[PDB]
Design a protein around this ligand. Structure first.
Ligand SMILES: [Mg+2]
Ligand SMILES: [Mg+2]
Ligand SMILES: [Mg+2]
Ligand SMILES: [Mg+2]
Ligand SMILES: [Mg+2]
Ligand SMILES: [Mg+2]
Ligand SMILES: [Mg+2]
Ligand SMILES: [Mg+2]
Ligand SMILES: [Mg+2]
Ligand SMILES: [Mg+2]
Ligand SMILES: [Mg+2]
Ligand SMILES: [Mg+2]
Ligand SMILES: [Mg+2]
Ligand SMILES: [Mg+2]
Ligand SMILES: [Mg+2]
Ligand SMILES: [Mg+2]
Ligand SMILES: [Mg+2]
Ligand SMILES: [Mg+2]
Ligand SMILES: [Mg+2]
Ligand SMILES: [Mg+2]
Ligand SMILES: [Mg+2]
Ligand SMILES: [Mg+2]
Ligand SMILES: [Mg+2]
Ligand SMILES: [Mg+2]
Ligand SMILES: [Mg+2]
Ligand SMILES: [Mg+2]
Ligand SMILES: [Mg+2]
Ligand SMILES: [Mg+2]
Ligand SMILES: [Mg+2]
Ligand SMILES: [Mg+2]
Ligand SMILES: [Mg+2]
Ligand SMILES: [Mg+2]
Ligand SMILES: [Mg+2]
Ligand SMILES: [Mg+2]
Ligand SMILES: [Mg+2]
Ligand SMILES: [Mg+2]
Ligand SMILES: [Mg+2]
Ligand SMILES: [Mg+2]
Ligand SMILES: [Mg+2]
Ligand SMILES: [Mg+2]
Ligand SMILES: [Mg+2]
Ligand SMILES: [Mg+2]
Ligand SMILES: [Mg+2]
Ligand SMILES: [Mg+2]
Ligand SMILES: [Mg+2]
Ligand SMILES: [Mg+2]
Ligand SMILES: [Mg+2]
Ligand SMILES: [Mg+2]
Ligand SMILES: [Mg+2]
Ligand SMILES: [Mg+2]
Ligand SMILES: [Mg+2]
Ligand SMILES: [Mg+2]
Ligand SMILES: [Mg+2]
Ligand SMILES: [Mg+2]
Ligand SMILES: [Mg+2]
Ligand SMILES: [Mg+2]
Ligand SMILES: [Mg+2]
Ligand SMILES: [Mg+2]
Ligand SMILES: [Mg+2]
Ligand SMILES: [Mg+2]
Ligand SMILES: [Mg+2]
Ligand SMILES: [Mg+2]
Ligand SMILES: [Mg+2]
Ligand SMILES: [Mg+2]
Ligand SMILES: [Mg+2]
Ligand SMILES: [Mg+2]
Ligand SMILES: [Mg+2]
Ligand SMILES: [Mg+2]
Ligand SMILES: [Mg+2]
Ligand SMILES: [Mg+2]
Ligand SMILES: [Mg+2]
Ligand SMILES: [Mg+2]
Ligand SMILES: [Mg+2]
Ligand SMILES: [Mg+2]
Ligand SMILES: [Mg+2]
Ligand SMILES: [Mg+2]
Ligand SMILES: [Mg+2]
Ligand SMILES: [Mg+2]
Ligand SMILES: [Mg+2]
Ligand SMILES: [Mg+2]
Ligand SMILES: [Mg+2]
Ligand SMILES: [Mg+2]
Ligand SMILES: [Mg+2]
Lengths: 210, 147
RNA sequence: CUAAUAGGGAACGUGAGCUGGGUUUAGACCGUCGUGAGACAGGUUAGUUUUACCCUACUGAUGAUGUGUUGUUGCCAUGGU
RNA sequence: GAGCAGAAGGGCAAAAGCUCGCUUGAUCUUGAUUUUCAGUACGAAUACAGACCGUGAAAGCGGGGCCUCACGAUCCUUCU
RNA sequence: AAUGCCUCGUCAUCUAAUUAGUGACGCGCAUGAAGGAUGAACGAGAUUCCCACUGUCCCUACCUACUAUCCAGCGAAACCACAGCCAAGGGAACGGGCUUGGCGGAAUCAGCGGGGAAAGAAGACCCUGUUGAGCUUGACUCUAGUCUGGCACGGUGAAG
RNA sequence: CAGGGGAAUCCGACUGUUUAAUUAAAACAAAGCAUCGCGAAGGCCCGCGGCGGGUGUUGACGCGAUGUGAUUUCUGCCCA
RNA sequence: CCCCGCGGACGCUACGCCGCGACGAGUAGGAGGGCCGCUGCGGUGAGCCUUGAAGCCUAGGGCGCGGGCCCGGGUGGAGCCGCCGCAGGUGCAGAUCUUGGUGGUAGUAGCAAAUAUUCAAACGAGAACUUUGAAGGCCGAAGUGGAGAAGGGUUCCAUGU
RNA sequence: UGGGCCACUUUUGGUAAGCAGAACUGGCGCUGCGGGAUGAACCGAACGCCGGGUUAAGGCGCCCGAUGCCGACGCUCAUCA
RNA sequence: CGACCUGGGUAUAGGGGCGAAAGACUAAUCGAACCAUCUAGUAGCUGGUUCCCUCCGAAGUUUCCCUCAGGAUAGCUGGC
RNA sequence: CGGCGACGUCGGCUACCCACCCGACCCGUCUUGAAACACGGACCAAGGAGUCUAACACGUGCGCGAGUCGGGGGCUCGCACGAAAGCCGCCGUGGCGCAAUGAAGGUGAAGGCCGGCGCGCUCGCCGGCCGAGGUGGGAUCCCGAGGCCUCUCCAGUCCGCCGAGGGCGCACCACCGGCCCGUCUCGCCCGCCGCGCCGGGGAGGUGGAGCACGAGCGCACGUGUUAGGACCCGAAAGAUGG
RNA sequence: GGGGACCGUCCCCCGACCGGCGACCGGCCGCCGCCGGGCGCAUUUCCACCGCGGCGGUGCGCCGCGACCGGCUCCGGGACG
RNA sequence: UCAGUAACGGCGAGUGAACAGGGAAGAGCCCAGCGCCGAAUCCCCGCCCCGCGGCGGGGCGCGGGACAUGUGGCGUACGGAAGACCCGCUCCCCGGCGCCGCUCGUGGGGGGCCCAAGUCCUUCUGAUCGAGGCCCAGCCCGUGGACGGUGUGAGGCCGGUAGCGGCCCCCGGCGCGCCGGGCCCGGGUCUUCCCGGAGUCGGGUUGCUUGGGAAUGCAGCCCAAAGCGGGUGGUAAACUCCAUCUAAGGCUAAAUACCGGCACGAGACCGAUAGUCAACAAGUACCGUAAGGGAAAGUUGAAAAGAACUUUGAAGAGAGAGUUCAAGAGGGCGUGAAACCGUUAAGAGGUAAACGGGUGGGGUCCGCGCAGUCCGCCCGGAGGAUUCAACCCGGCGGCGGGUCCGGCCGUGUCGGCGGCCCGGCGGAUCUUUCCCGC
């Protein structure tokens, strides 16, 4: 029964919840287990980067996050094509590739091919047979400079262009931001009905002259 | 700590604080929000007006990201940039005004609560309010729009 | 018939006192009522009546306190009548 | 001592009754208040304010019936 | 009348006396025809009377067997706030306790059925519960099965 | 060892059966009477399901469903 | 300008100490305090203890309004407590409460369905009851007789206790 | 907590009721204590543990504290006071 | 001497069976067996509800409710 | 000031038994009312009932504070304790708060004083300032005439206390204005790479869980309500499978 | 993208002046106190005992008595207006 | 996390996701079809060799069969194929021979055996592991002071514990030279070609289901496709543009779950009516025809040293004796409460007991009770002894000192001599007008 002022509460405990309760007493054990597995995997892929393949630069989808950039699933086929890496060879040198991602603009495409080129310059390719190097790399640099990179490969950072203070021009001072927004909203709202009324006026004009 | 509770003090008192006449029974009055229109009507009308009935249009598949638009007021506008920016702008001999991009700081709309200091400033935002734009222009600033 | 066949109370005295004819379970019949299941301070028939060895009360039966022990013969307070 | 639709009570005389004439204030609106009351709702009612009107020479009076009763949430439907 | 309220109907008969019985009457509260009315035989069925018989009774007595009783051995249970003499008072309006009075003498045995509103069972009567269940029905809402139409399996020829 | 008898009234015809553990009855059954359905691609019924199954190794003098309750005697009127 | 005396009680865990005035009923219920009590953990007591822990008993000595506590004596034989915090499966007279034990009843009800026993002897610590003998009875062949089915499962048979 | 009940007075129904229902204040419930022999409510008075004093209501033959006053004035005889 | 009594073997299983019908019988259980589980079913109803002291201290009334043995609400209470 | 004091006496109101006077009905419980002829209770021992989770609300304590919070993940020989603790900061994603209002499209919280201009037309283009208005209360604080002093007076040296009045006014309260969103009524203007069935503005009422120089966030504790077996024990029943 | 410049905080120093030596410490002085060792060996100092010694505090092992003072209270005499 | 939200709901009670974002993990692919390639393909049976450790490789068969009603190679929506032209030779996966780095947080795993230091002195006790001590800065070891056993309570008595400690045996995947076999061309440009899953989608209706609301998903029945087509685009429909994917075939590790099992470790849990029903010959005894129901029940002592022997009795049972520290531990034996019972002792008793208040009597104990306290100063008497004060030396403290001298501390204060090479970290502050990508 309600008692004086309060909040109308709707607890979701009508459904035998006590049989399905997930305790978390194995959480520290799970953290230990995952950490040990990570260490073992890093040991297994001895000079290769621990975190894994290099991921592309990707812009977050919706209107809430599209000002932000994160790591994607893999480099697109167009990116690999214009960077000059075979799509079946990239996955062996540690480049992730997403065959289902397209590129809608050229700026993201160019940023990701610059990323691929920089990674390709940073790569140290060991020869397949250590005694005989065919086209991999120089032993002088691969003997010393080869170490296991920790963390993501070239981690994706959000870059902000610095805006230097400038003198405000009279055009900027005369621009009406609120009126521009209101008129833009009205124009987008009434674009279709205006076109229909213009078509009907064309029909009226021809029937009046005829 | 169970040693700090009324149950420790209620040992020896037969009814445990629930009365001898009305007792402590299972569910007198119903379970949950039972009878909110019948025998708890006074409570519901008194403390939760508007509880019963429908109002407005329903909208399936609401995506809150579409309507995401955080706002910042003009009185907090100058806190989005460093102290050095404002000080240098104040002591600048030229007409160079700093740019505050509120989208970079994480806001889309600039609202016009509060007053601004008397310094020209270029504000970049997705949306403006009429009074925010008026107050920005009154200090000699400008409002530019971004998408 | 008799002198007279007065009226009453005691958990409408009295069921571990009895009896069980009546009412008041379950079976059944009739009449009335109800569409029906069923109902009827309507009629009719058949239908398990358990325990006292405790306390008291009462009835009888031993005894007990006191006169040193014990016995015989007695008195009558009280109660009944 | 009649009448005012009705129960009763109150009220009422160049009235509030009777007969005429013109009408649609029985309309469109926002709030406040009273009554029951928890000072919640409904119903009913009072005083205003803004429109548009009626009547009267006008002052005014009128947003139903002289006053006290004559009535109805959520959800759904229907109309404007 | 196993069916009649009024009703112990009225008349006759049975008895000293009959709310009983039988016969009869019948505007029959509310008899009655697949059930009405009869009719032998039958019945651990209900009822009335007569003969005979008797302890059913007047009106109780005596006898027998087994108990009870006493003893040796053996040995429970129910029940139990504390307990256990009354009268009146007042009191949850019927006290073992309280008040006022009557009074009160160890430990016991055989009986007894007045009390302990004795024991047995969380009253089955009665009411309440937004507690049921068995059953019924044009209660509300359904449902198996059935009747019917349509589509499919589903084809070949003719006439109308 | 081994029937008391007689005159009647009510009910059920009889014999039979019945509520193991309160009712042995007038209750149920019964033969008799009457009605109803059905000719098998059927009647009545079972089955979650199969052209499954019982009556049925049956066929109207038979199955199935009802009422009343031997014999005798009657069984009236009403289809709103 | 203290000085023949060189001196002068206690106090003030300030969450402490002191003073003054008024007041004190209480079911249901609320609150505070608990140096009341139980069990376990972190600290601490250079804690206690086989020269005797816990527990239990006690006409022993006391303290507190009380919840309770301390100490003596006995028994016991291996562990236990104080303080500061922490944490509860933390306090019982009741629930026709649960389990266990024990009373009165009470040496009581009772060991009363189917006729019935008696004498002598033996064995034996011991005989109403066992065994033998004698007598008197019963079942009375639809048996208290002789054999089976089902069911039981070694009860069958000796010897011993 | 949302069963109330009682008393003075007012008061409705009822023949009345230790009945049913209202108003006002107090009380009992929740409350012990002195008195009414006894008693939820009446009268006095409300309560921490004590000593002294004094009262209330009520009493002062004996139970049983206190008239064991040379108390005052009358009335009254009851074979149900 | 019969619709007779009876052994064993078989068949029918729970909203089912079987019933010469009593709601009878269906393993001392029948107006719906027994066993386990859902299940610690729900209960406005009955019973119980465990240490001490100190301080404060009620209500049986209003309004609404398929409300009348219950709630919400206001009142009365305590604490801060 | 007196008496008495070791094998007999002295003190010990507690504690054991007994006696007497007064008082005293059996507890629990429901109840207007229990000693009840109302129910449970023969006795003793041990067990035995408001708990935990989640969610709210308010109060209190702590830290930080327009912010706050790592709780999920990751890094530190992987591990007696340690499943702890520590750290991350381009792990703060995110939550809650910092903005409301409307069904929605959407919109979205600064005014006051002093001047010259239109007509200072109930007012539009500016300037200068200040930076959330005012009224009545308002703890505290500030000023303060006049007094309170010594062995005494004519005359100033430095401050202490009382002080009528006066001032600035915290929080909070009442009231009046103002602003934001919705919605009515009235009305005249302005804007333009879209001259529009376009966009903006004003005044006066009114609806809002609003603004008007933030108070929140996290943690702990208490209380209350609620969903859960839900303080403990208790149905008649219903369902599934045997 | 680097590398610079600037700004803001910092970390050490070179230094002059300012408040103080502080609850951050040493050295010197001055005063004071204590301890150890000398000297001081007696009208000083200290130790233990005795007196039924005096003055102070607490208090008598037990049982008791008295006195005056003060607080409260109940009474009784005497006298004045 | 979104989110108790959008939504569903007698819009009542109640129910209720997803996307984006941050993380754990991360991995991709294969057919059918269309095509080309003399079926290139596969299974089985024989015989020979290498082998065995799960039965494979190689070779032969005028040896069978499967299969054109389609096996294999290329190839699969990310396009693919074939021809040209150009460029790049770049190097695959199996099973062993000997040996490493000895595999890995310092053995990879399994198993076996081992590795420090008091039983020192004196004592307590029934026994001790107790108590005191152990000169050299302290008994000895300690990378070991976890735990358990042992007659007590033990780092050093024993097992163990610590250790990138030791020894032995066995097992498994990691590189090199070789061995035996397979092992066959990749990319870029152009040209010419080739491109897809049907009683399926979709529609109607019915029933269930979902937050899915003019129908989210699933299924039944009926209708039943297309190929610039089809599906989706959270309000039914028509037109139109756009976006996005490519259904009706298939495989796939990791992160995730785990009240059964095998083997471990731990705990602010329970401590024999508790904790599992079960600490024990427990799913046992027992109950029911069956399904099923289902207990109670731990403890002598350090060691059995478990009472020899005598004596009464027929024996149970006793009295002596004996063991033990203890039988006042005697085989359901640690301790041994209460209720209840027996006996002994004291007291009492006709108003059932019991209780509150107040006394009294008796009794049991307590009081080191029994000539009753101490101690400060002073007076007197009788005695001792260093030494009392004051001075000298030394040490140590307290206080004060213009800082007398330092060392300083807070606060300013200039040159920054001093820090982006000769000090750091930040900044939403400006730049090559020296330097690495248009
Ligand atoms: Mg990862
Ligand atoms: Mg209380
Ligand atoms: Mg009530
Ligand atoms: Mg008489
Ligand atoms: Mg009677
Ligand atoms: Mg009787
Ligand atoms: Mg009887
Ligand atoms: Mg009878
Ligand atoms: Mg009957
Ligand atoms: Mg009979
Ligand atoms: Mg006499
Ligand atoms: Mg008007
Ligand atoms: Mg009759
Ligand atoms: Mg007769
Ligand atoms: Mg007759
Ligand atoms: Mg007929
Ligand atoms: Mg009496
Ligand atoms: Mg009852
Ligand atoms: Mg009952
Ligand atoms: Mg009700
Ligand atoms: Mg029902
Ligand atoms: Mg119907
Ligand atoms: Mg018959
Ligand atoms: Mg007949
Ligand atoms: Mg029979
Ligand atoms: Mg019977
Ligand atoms: Mg019978
Ligand atoms: Mg016939
Ligand atoms: Mg027939
Ligand atoms: Mg006819
Ligand atoms: Mg008082
Ligand atoms: Mg009190
Ligand atoms: Mg408990
Ligand atoms: Mg108990
Ligand atoms: Mg109790
Ligand atoms: Mg006997
Ligand atoms: Mg007998
Ligand atoms: Mg014979
Ligand atoms: Mg035989
Ligand atoms: Mg009354
Ligand atoms: Mg009450
Ligand atoms: Mg009161
Ligand atoms: Mg009172
Ligand atoms: Mg009294
Ligand atoms: Mg009286
Ligand atoms: Mg007094
Ligand atoms: Mg008297
Ligand atoms: Mg007297
Ligand atoms: Mg009289
Ligand atoms: Mg019946
Ligand atoms: Mg239950
Ligand atoms: Mg209603
Ligand atoms: Mg009740
Ligand atoms: Mg009760
Ligand atoms: Mg009553
Ligand atoms: Mg009582
Ligand atoms: Mg009574
Ligand atoms: Mg009774
Ligand atoms: Mg009761
Ligand atoms: Mg009991
Ligand atoms: Mg009882
Ligand atoms: Mg207990
Ligand atoms: Mg951590
Ligand atoms: Mg964010
Ligand atoms: Mg003000
Ligand atoms: Mg205002
Ligand atoms: Mg609340
Ligand atoms: Mg429960
Ligand atoms: Mg149901
Ligand atoms: Mg939220
Ligand atoms: Mg659901
Ligand atoms: Mg092929
Ligand atoms: Mg060793
Ligand atoms: Mg040990
Ligand atoms: Mg050890
Ligand atoms: Mg080791
Ligand atoms: Mg749409
Ligand atoms: Mg157990
Ligand atoms: Mg035990
Ligand atoms: Mg024996
Ligand atoms: Mg011993
Ligand atoms: Mg023992
Ligand atoms: Mg004794």
């Amino acid at each position: 029964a309600p008692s004086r002022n309060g909040m109308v509460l709707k607890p979701h405990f009508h459904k035998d919840w006590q049989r399905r309760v997930a305790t978390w007493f194995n959480q520290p054990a799970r953290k230990i287990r995952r950490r040990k597995a990570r260490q073992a995997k890093a040991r297994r892929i001895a000079p290769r980067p621990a975190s894994g393949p290099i991921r592309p630069i990707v812009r977050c989808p919706t209107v809430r996050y599209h000002t932000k950039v994160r790591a994607g699933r893999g480099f697109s086929l167009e990116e690999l094509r214009v960077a000059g890496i075979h799509k079946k060879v990239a996955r062996t040198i540690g480049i992730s590739v997403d065959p289902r991602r397209r590129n809608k603009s050229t700026e993201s495409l160019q940023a990701n091919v610059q990323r691929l080129k920089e990674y390709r310059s940073k790569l140290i390719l060991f020869p397949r047979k250590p005694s005989a190097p065919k086209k991999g790399d120089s032993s002088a640099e691969e003997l010393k400079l080869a170490t296991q990179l920790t963390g993501p490969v070239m981690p994706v950072r959000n870059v902000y262009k610095k805006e230097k203070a400038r003198v405000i021009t009279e055009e900027e001072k005369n621009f009406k931001a609120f009126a521009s927004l209101r008129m833009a909203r009205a124009n987008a709202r009434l674009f279709g009905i205006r076109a229909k009324r213009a078509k009907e006026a064309a029909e009226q004009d021809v029937e009046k002259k005829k | 700590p169970s040693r700090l509770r009324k149950t420790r003090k209620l040992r020896g008192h037969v009814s445990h604080g629930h009365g001898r006449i009305g007792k402590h029974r299972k569910h007198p009055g119903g379970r949950g929000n039972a009878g909110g229109l019948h025998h708890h009507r006074i409570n519901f009308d008194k403390y939760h007006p508007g509880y019963f009935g429908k109002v407005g249009m329903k909208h399936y598949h609401l995506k809150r990201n579409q309507s995401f638009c955080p706002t910042v007021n003009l009185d907090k506008l100058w806190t989005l940039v460093s102290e050095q920016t404002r000080v240098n702008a104040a002591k600048n001999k030229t007409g160079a005004a700093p740019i505050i991009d509120v989208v970079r700081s994480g806001y889309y709309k600039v609202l016009g609560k509060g007053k601004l200091p008397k310094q020209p400033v270029i504000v970049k935002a997705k949306f403006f309010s009429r009074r925010a734009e008026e107050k920005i222009k009154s200090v000699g600033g400008a409002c530019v729009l971004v998408a």
